[PDB]
Amino acid sequence: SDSFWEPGNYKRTTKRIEDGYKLCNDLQQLIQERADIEKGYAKSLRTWSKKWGELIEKGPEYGTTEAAWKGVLTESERISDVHMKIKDNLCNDVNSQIKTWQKENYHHTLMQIKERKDLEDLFKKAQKPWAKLLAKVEKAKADYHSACKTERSATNQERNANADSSLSPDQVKKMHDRVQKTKDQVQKCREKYEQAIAEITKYNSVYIEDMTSVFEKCQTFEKTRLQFFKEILFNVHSCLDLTKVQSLPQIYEEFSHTINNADQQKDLKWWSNNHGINMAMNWPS
Amino acid sequence: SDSFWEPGNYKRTTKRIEDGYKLCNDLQQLIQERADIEKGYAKSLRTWSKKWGELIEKGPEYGTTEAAWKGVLTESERISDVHMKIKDNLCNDVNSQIKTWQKENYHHTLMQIKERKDLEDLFKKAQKPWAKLLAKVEKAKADYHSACKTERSATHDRVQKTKDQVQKCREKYEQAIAEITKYNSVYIEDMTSVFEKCQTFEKTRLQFFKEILFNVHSCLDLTKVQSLPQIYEEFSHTINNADQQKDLKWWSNNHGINMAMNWPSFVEYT
Ligand code: NA
Ligand code: NA
Ligand code: NA
């Protein structure tokens, strides 16, 4: 079966050590990826703000109204910083931590992950004795079913010898001898089989102890990985939680301070001063 | 000079009307562009979410730990929806109300903006009488200035009829002047009146842009997105459900020592 207790089957557990390495790679990759998305948004915002900053400048809007329009560009700048800092937090608070743990817990030798290779070895050692007894049981079982088979086809041929009266006495005798010799075989074999089953049945618990002990070494390492991953996940969470960016309220507060300063009278009066009736004229003389 | 009072120069006030209308188009383009960026963030988030959602199921992580990694995917999805609403509010709401105001306060004759032609007309009307007096002043200034020239090289029939000429020029010059000087008050009064119509209208727009900027602000103002504190608790509870004990127990049952075994048993012969 697929049972753990079956020879070689501890390999799902050892494979899981190496899966732990892979999941470090995956998590780093996933975070880096989100980081690029945040870099990308901020980068877009800034491009936008550079573009309109200039179109407003160079275009017809003026005065505090101009300054109000500009408020929006300042907003997006402050927002972009927030997002750069999340990019930077994800990469140097979070990803580096993972990068570090992964370096520290997985070593690479002989085209293997040593933590895997060592433990496969430890299981293999733990399982070797009982593998023998299992092998024995399996020979004994085969060696006894083929003795059963022989004996049934040998007692057959004797059938049709005592009904073939031309055979020589030596021929009739060989067949008689084979039957008796092959039922020595059925017996001898039943015995070795029963003894092999007994021999293994007494090792089982030693086997169980041994494998339990190796398995739990594995569970302990795994426990640790799972704990670590839980923490980094919270650390990720910290990086992304907007409700804790303390500047956010202030960005909007300040953004509407600017809109509020948009003053039509200031703007209009200025316009007259520079372009309309409140300019000097010397009349003709 | 570039003084508004010289003929022609009312025009910068006039260009301003049409610049008004132009700015509405610019404003909508600005907002449209911001909205597109928001939509970009949101689309990105979801692509990322869909990608890793798959790569995680497929990968080795299982259990509640696996459900915690999926926390991020959900938060990401929720953030995308916040920005998608920002796109929509900006577009389907702020931009259309500009579009509406644009069409309520500007109208065209043929290809030209009517409010601008009207007020260019009124300017010219008021400027015209005065411009005519100024045209007079300009002629009689030139007449006099070349009765200067045609009595400087005369210093006997061309000696006293050109002192008669500096009598009739300096006379006329000084009366064109008196005449314009008398119209000034009126011209002042009528340019004043037209310019005020230009200011009243321009004021409408300045007040309207203030309002629209406030709306843009309400649209963009993260501190007022209700759902957002809550997104991040939904997320942390998900992380907090990672239970290594159950994930480990699960493993021991499906892959490790608590699995059942058949121990070797004597099997008989066919
Ligand atoms: Na400008
Ligand atoms: Na999985
Ligand atoms: Na829990």
Q: Is residue A146 part of a domain?
A: yes
Q: Is residue A285 part of a domain?
A: no
Is residue A80 within 8 Å of residue A247, measured between CB atoms? no
Q: Which of A11, A133, A224, A229 to mutate to test the interface with B (most CBs of B within 10 A)?
A: A229
User: A124 CB contacts (<8 Å, ≥6 apart)?
Assistant: none
- The torsion angles phi and psi of B109, rounded to 5 degrees, stand at -95, 120
Q: Is residue B119 part of a domain?
A: yes
State the method. X-ray
Q: Which amino acid is at A135?
A: A
Q: Is residue B265 part of a domain?
A: no
- CA distance between the termini of chain A: 117
Q: Which amino acid is at A150?
A: T
Is residue B170 within 8 Å of residue B144, measured between CB atoms? yes
Contacts with A193 from chain B: Cβ below 8 Å: 266
The Cα A91–Cα A87 span in angstroms is 6
CB atoms within 10 A of CB A121: 12
Is residue B102 within 8 Å of residue A249, measured between CB atoms? no
Chain A to chain B Cβ contacts (< 8 Å): 230
Q: Is residue B81 part of a domain?
A: yes
Q: Which of A3, A233, A254 to mutate to test the interface with B (most CBs of B within 10 A)?
A: A233
Q: Which of B34, B132, B170 to mutate to test the interface with A (most CBs of A within 10 A)?
A: B34
Nearest CA-CA distance, residue A170 and chain B, Å:
32
Nearest CA-CA distance, residue B49 and chain A, Å:
9
Nearest CA-CA distance, residue B237 and chain A, Å:
10
Q: Resolution to 1 decimal, in Å?
A: 2.7
Is residue A140 within 8 Å of residue A196, measured between CB atoms? yes
Nearest CA-CA distance, residue A192 and chain B, Å:
11
Distances (CA, A) of A127 to A136, B66, B256, B258: 14, 32, 14, 17
Please list, residue by residue across A166-205, b when 16 or more beta carbons sit within 10 angstroms of its beta carbon and e when fewer do.
eeeeeeeeebeebbeebbebbeebbebbeebbeebeeeee
Q: Is residue B254 part of a domain?
A: yes
Residue B3: left if φ>0, alpha if ψ -120 to 50, beta else—which one? beta
Ligand 2 centroid from CA B63, angstroms: 8
- The torsion angles phi and psi of A33, rounded to 5 degrees, stand at -60, -45
Distances (CA, A) of B205 to A61, A67, A280: 11, 15, 27
Q: How many CA atoms lie within 13 A of A282 on its CB side?
A: 3
Q: How many domains does chain A have?
A: 1
Burial class from Cβ neighbours inside 10 Å (0-12, 13-18, 19+) for residue B2 reads exposed
Answer whether A234 sits within 8 Å of B236, measured CB to CB: yes
Nearest CA to A226 out of B35, B69, B76 is that of B69
Answer whether A237 sits within 8 Å of B71, measured CB to CB: yes
Answer whether A137 sits within 8 Å of B221, measured CB to CB: no
- Nearest chain A alpha carbon to B180: A284
The strand pairing partners of A108, in sequence order, are: A113
Nearest CA-CA distance, residue A30 and chain B, Å:
7
Contacts with A215 from chain B: Cβ below 8 Å: 252, 256-257
Quote the Cα angle for B153-B156-B159, to 5°: 50
Ligand 2 centroid from CA A9, angstroms: 20
Domain residues for the domain of A269 are 1-278
3-state secondary structure of A109: strand
Answer whether A259 sits within 8 Å of B210, measured CB to CB: yes
Nearest CA-CA distance, residue B25 and chain A, Å:
12
- Tokens (6 digits) for B48: 């990322």
Answer whether A30 sits within 8 Å of B72, measured CB to CB: yes
Answer whether B177 sits within 8 Å of A285, measured CB to CB: yes
**Partner-chain residue, chosen from A4, A30, A204, that has the shortest CB–CB distance to B255:** A4
Residues with CB under 5 A from ligand 2 (ion): B 61
Q: Is residue B266 part of a domain?
A: no
Answer whether B259 sits within 8 Å of A5, measured CB to CB: yes
- Nearest chain B alpha carbon to A250: B223
Q: Is residue A165 part of a domain?
A: yes
- The torsion angles phi and psi of A113, rounded to 5 degrees, stand at -95, 115
Answer whether A283 sits within 8 Å of B217, measured CB to CB: no
Contacts with B23 from chain A: Cβ below 8 Å: 59-61
Nearest CA to A60 out of B66, B24, B34 is that of B24
CATH code of the domain covering residue B196: 1.20.1270.60
Is residue A255 within 8 Å of residue B217, measured between CB atoms? yes
User: A115 CB contacts (<8 Å, ≥6 apart)?
Assistant: A17, A105, A106, A107, A221
The Cα B173–Cα B107 span in angstroms is 46
- CA distance between the termini of chain B: 122
Distances (CA, A) of A244 to A82, A93, B48, B243, B254: 11, 16, 24, 26, 41
**Crossing angle (nearest 10°) for helices B165-220 and A248-260:** 150
Ligand 1 centroid from CA A58, angstroms: 5
Answer whether B213 sits within 8 Å of A27, measured CB to CB: no
Contacts with B265 from chain A: Cβ below 8 Å: 197
Contacts with B134 from chain A: Cβ below 8 Å: 284
The Cα A24–Cα A96 span in angstroms is 11
Answer whether A248 sits within 8 Å of B223, measured CB to CB: yes
